[PDB]
Amino acid sequence: MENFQKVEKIGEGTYGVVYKARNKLTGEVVALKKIRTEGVPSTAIREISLLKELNHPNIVKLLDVIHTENKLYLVFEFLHQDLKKFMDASALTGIPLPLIKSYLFQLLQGLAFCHSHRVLHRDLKPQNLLINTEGAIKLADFGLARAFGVPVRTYTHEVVTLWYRAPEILLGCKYYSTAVDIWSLGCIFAEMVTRRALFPGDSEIDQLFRIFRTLGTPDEVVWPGVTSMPDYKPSFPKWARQDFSKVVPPLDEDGRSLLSQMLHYDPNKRISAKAALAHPFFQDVTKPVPHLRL
Ligand SMILES: NC(=O)c1cc([N+](=O)[O-])c(NCCCC(=O)O)cc1NCc1cccnc1
């Protein structure tokens, strides 16, 4: 990197390698992502470029989109840890409820902002949620999925996780709505509470069936139009819905109520980020600081 001294390899993203780097001129420390074949789609350039204006305190800031030497680099503000690592590290005692609530509240503010500007994430997961020592949490990679697509395998053959995928996506819908992000966030909220992934599928059908086994196989009553979806099969087994009290114990009724609205099958009935922010669950929200050992 000409203007960047590579500090460390942060990981192998969905699109390419990500490095923590230091701008040799300003000294600012950033996250530099090298995106993957030959020519760089011009449409992706314009689209990604527009994201430079999508600024909000709970959205990882896109500092620059470098299209030089016919290669694509994205420069992002740097945060020291992601939620996946934090959850793993908090697995023995669990993340305290006040912090889970603060993070969920901040994540919803972030979604509310992007959604009002017509930008969707589409692939939210704990690894895409970044946190700092101040108690803030931010969403990373908003809008990139649209600029590219679903790779199935990152770039190093790693398997892309399906655990947070909305059911309308699994059923073949071609047009995603903002509801897909609320679904993923609901799945993450449940994982923070129980300390185990809600729907850890290892194939598209296993993912769909794990959802059906917990929330019941969807039908025309709860989801008008579901039986006409591209990948819907009348042969899907019919499972009864389980009670949330059994799905995310020992979360209280305000939390179960909100989660239930974030996991509604019908994308149109699923709660919006804006409405979720007004839910009684956030009546006593605060902003605690996490125990972060960097
Ligand atoms: N913008 C960023 O600061 C950042 C970007 C990406 N990413 O662009 O991908 C990322 N990968 C998420 C890791 C995904 C994984 O392999 O599990 C993590 C980040 N920071 C948190 C962090 C975490 C660990 C070490 N150091 C910093």
From Swiss-Prot:
Residues engaged in binding Mg(2+): N128, D141
Keywords tagged on the record: Acetylation, ATP-binding, Cell cycle, Cell division, Cytoplasm, Cytoskeleton, DNA damage, DNA repair, Endosome, Kinase, Magnesium, Meiosis, Metal-binding, Mitosis, Nucleotide-binding, Nucleus, Phosphoprotein, S-nitrosylation, Serine/threonine-protein kinase, Transferase
Annotated control of activity: Phosphorylation at Thr-14 or Tyr-15 inactivates the enzyme, while phosphorylation at Thr-156 activates it.
Cofactor binding annotation: Binds 2 Mg(2+) ions.
Post-translational modification: Phosphorylated at Thr-156 by CDK7 in a CAK complex. Phosphorylation at Thr-156 promotes kinase activity, whereas phosphorylation at Tyr-15 by WEE1 reduces slightly kinase activity. Phosphorylated on Thr-14 and Tyr-15 during S and G2 phases before being dephosphorylated by CDC25A. Nitrosylated after treatment with nitric oxide (DETA-NO).
Stated family: Belongs to the protein kinase superfamily. CMGC Ser/Thr protein kinase family. CDC2/CDKX subfamily.
This protein's name: Cyclin-dependent kinase 2
